[PDB]
């Protein structure tokens, strides 16, 4: 009849993962009554303009040879360092490989992606270079942009020894800094769901074609195994590469966060479904869903073209992972950044495990099967109206909890005990103009 | 605590898609808070007995050659026109290709389906002929029935430029007419869920079998790639072809609508689940689930027959599409129709889109993130008791809305404000006998 | 506003499938309004130490030859009969093949499983032998353990003629007996969810490799169809074979039932989700999810190793079946059993069907579309706190129904009419110590 | 009705309701000779049936009578050709089809 | 509970078979285009009897006559391959089994 304390703790960490008050860790209030272990991974990364020693090439040059550094094409990347730059980060719902960093010389027209599978994508301290024409870069080409993945190794080790898992919350903070007199630049942020799913795409097989010139062997075996089969299953993410562009994100979403670069960002990525069931760890190769090339039977075709159906271009990331379903994909863009910047990424990912018997997690479990559907309904009705991102320093939201949770906790059905808490109005998040007001009209003075 | 106006509008269009009052268009009340574009496709088709110019053959004759018209076997189809005929329409949950029309000389024993993939299935104005023995028809065979698909091209164009979609409602009206003194015939209608799903079936590969008679080449490479693999994924629909027959539908379902032919029909197809999540457009080849031929490991078998597991016969429709899950499959049969009939199909399909950034839909969006779980519960408890179909002219249901929605809106949980609206009783839909009574016993006089 | 009688009947049969009062049969209270047939399969099996005539070998010996009995290696199995033994049963959610029996000479270190596909797994009256080293047993090896499946043929026959199905409840009783003065032994029991799912794993193809020594034929066709494709889809069950061991189950779960062997067991397997949608019968080969052997792209690899992604070892059971999703997997262990024991397994499985039109089930249907979300919520909040198993004779739970159902029926939301029923406390299930108390502290005297 | 054979398909659809009623059997025996042999195809759901006819005959068998008088019973006139049809209680039957 | 529905009408030639000695050891024999006589029947009004014996299988027996018969005749000679509903079997005018080239 009334929301529990565990429900409040879960809501607080789910909506404000990196808030200062959220020190303890709590699990999903579904009352599964199973013995679970809740892990909290906090990581920090001081990303900046990479030096030459941490910069590899993904072309066919480093194909069978391992990672190849740049053969002093680094002069061109210094030429990048002469001017302003752009810095995108893409937070896919992948459990490990939490974010993808990407550096551009100028604002890209659209979020391009290589068509050939890159060789040896690099974890964060190293980067990997791509040519300007959306192609893999070998030494001697003309570099277009840089990319890297931010990897959490402990998450991999724990996911190895776990029967099931589910993501509880994830937040990403972007403390930005630059030398004095070089603070110019903008920042944009947006979340959006991606109907990523396990998919296998149609491919064609190789058939031997023998015309036996042998004297005794006149078989002329032309057996045709060249039929249509399924590729290995891959997790495909439909991200709108054209609409992942800066301007498209800005105009598309009314909750898109925009501010000056020095404000940083803070994205508490949110789920998109009421229920959060457990899943077994099934790491699979990730891929990005292009635009379909063979229409196939989508038009009246002969009775033989039914095989090569509506297949799509698949951009293979050459990264294997298991993703948290129903969680939003986040993305921020830093535009016009001074080349000698310094971005302190701070990620906090809290997630639940069912430990495999006799595994390392089995000793750290905790038995608190709290059940609270009031909190679940509160989150369900709160998700659609929370902002997508906030400035870096805007933790410790006063309106959360005492007011917002209480204000929405009285809506659901007949589960209302307190008569009335507070009217709820439309917030106006204008970080550019400094006319920002919260969910109750109270102005937000700038703390930093 | 009380159902909103948006909830009422959504319920009204979901239960009565083609009602006269439902002029405006409203979205699903889940409060996804995303920027969506809601499209409303209304189409009309005056289907009748096709002339010879719009009648192609699906046999191996039109295999590599495109569509082939009938080489004046049309005399037999005129002989059909001498007697009465039967007209089935099958509304699968496919987004485009809204319905499948099918014409028979007499009532079929069962809803047969070709085993070989037909060549060039035809959109509505043209038809495609099939032989009597459930085989593809080449010129010179003996025609068994005709078939066609009703295609919406705008739906295809819009589904191209959309990150996600979900079907809001769909209704099909069947205004029937015939020359005076030839109004004889019956009509039957029924909806039923089909657990259609993405499936890939086991197939076998082709292996080269070389016995090298070459003098220097004595390899005799007999390498066996002839293993078991997966076909390309297809959307398989388990429709009960034996139980899609007329009599089986009549006896099976107590909500099956039956009437005289001149009454037409009006099927507001209904969902079968409470939630309606967004889905990315994934058009795939459609197929119908036959009866499994290789039992495989379903019986104690040798350790080598585990490969060819329980595979089923797959009837390939040679039509690629993406379907709306959790929506019922509808079917109506017109029996004993006069051959010179005239059926005005009127389809209305309203569905939501998430527009891809920079796409054509992005300019037509609308920002009304209404949330109303009362309406969702009302629909959930109303679905099981609505009739499957109504006569063609029975729009503007008085009992809907002011009474039925209100009567059921007070059931759910404690979300009840109004004390009591009206008792709810068992309706008796007897369109044959003219003893029809609605959900409150009020008789329904015949308006047409 | 108040839970119906149908809701009470469904809850009673779902939580106490083999209780004496549950004589009538009732369906899921979701109000699907469809015409359904509810079937109740009760089976009994007097399992004991098998004789030599019912004991086949699964090695390559019985590969193409059918089932091969043991060539009088039965002396070793008699030597087993000299000492104590261990008897595991594993109740997977498979519809047919309800349980897997397994006999060991002593307590196994872990629930091993053969890596090669066994030949002709045997239904219950016969068994199949496996070697000590987790390998298939041919005549002349050294036997390690015995295994068998308990098969329900009527379930197969009915599942053939059904458009859809869903499992309503399933219970397994273990009446144990042994000769006087040989009642020593322990019994342990545990349920746990398994995220079993349809999966296809990466495999590699066979390519012909021809160097044409033919005089006229100098093609040297070395065409490489040796690419990566998908195996046939299989239902993979992630069971923790290391944590399916006795001690791991005992320590892991606080609801694990433990007692003396003579007490038997009674496991009412429970679902793990609120909703229970219908599913079409899709029998597929079952397999057990090992530990992945090829990491693949989980580490930075060359642009060519993306194909052989994170593949797992797959233990193929050589048994095809369709499973009930969201139902727990149960397992009991009998330890130190006297070799001349007698276990009376009593299984009761009640499940719903949608009959295919014109099929055998179509005549036995029943039209009671009751809707009761109160009962669904009651089950949802009751699942996490019910014990995993009870002694064999502990049917007819007094606390169920009049108190427990009523006590929890007042929690959900505002759907509360009766003021207060009874306080609910923590039960203490200690069958070893005879200090057992139910959900209201009332002690449970031993009826047997 | 069937007595299922063990292991057969019928065995999964049994019903335990051994109800006993001499009154119903006696009423059926009494009424067998009164009901007409057939009706028009559309003439189901008779008003007189059950609450009226079965009741008004249920006291006749022996003296198994609790309610004193339910309803007098008269000979019907099933003149379907002449549209002059009257049921067991004289109530005219207007054409419903 | 078995509920069944059938749509009986004047059968086409493909659903008629001969009961005479023609299809004695041979399986059912379709009419050798004596169907013109049945069309002659279709010229005028017909008669349709159904006889519901207490048989569990074979719920009813349908029968079509050119014109009302004086009695429910039957053939002293056993018919060959009696036909389940969608197919019919023809009997001659003289109350005997019908081979092709007789008077139905």
Residue numbers in the entry:
A (entry chain D), B (entry chain D), C (entry chain D): 66 to 513
D (entry chain C): 417 to 513
E (entry chain C): 105 to 208
What's the paper's own text on this?
The RNA genome sizes of LSV1 and LSV2 are ~5.6 kb, encoding three major genes: the Orf1 with the unclear function, RdRP responsible for viral RNA replication, and the capsid protein (CP) for the host recognition and viral capsid assembly. CP forms the capsid shell that protects genomes and is responsible for both host specificity and receptor binding to transport the viral genome into infected host cells, or for intracellular trafficking. We determine cryo-EM structures of T = 4 and T = 3 capsids of virus-like particles (VLPs) of Lake Sinai virus (LSV) 2 and delta-N48 LSV1, belonging to tetraviruses, at resolutions of 2.3–2.6 Å in various pH environments. Analyses of these capsid structures reveal the intermolecular interactions that drive subunits assembly into homo-trimeric capsomeres and eventually into a complete viral capsid in which specific domains, such as the N-terminal domain, the helical domain, and the β-barrel domain/C-arm, could encapsidate nucleic acids.
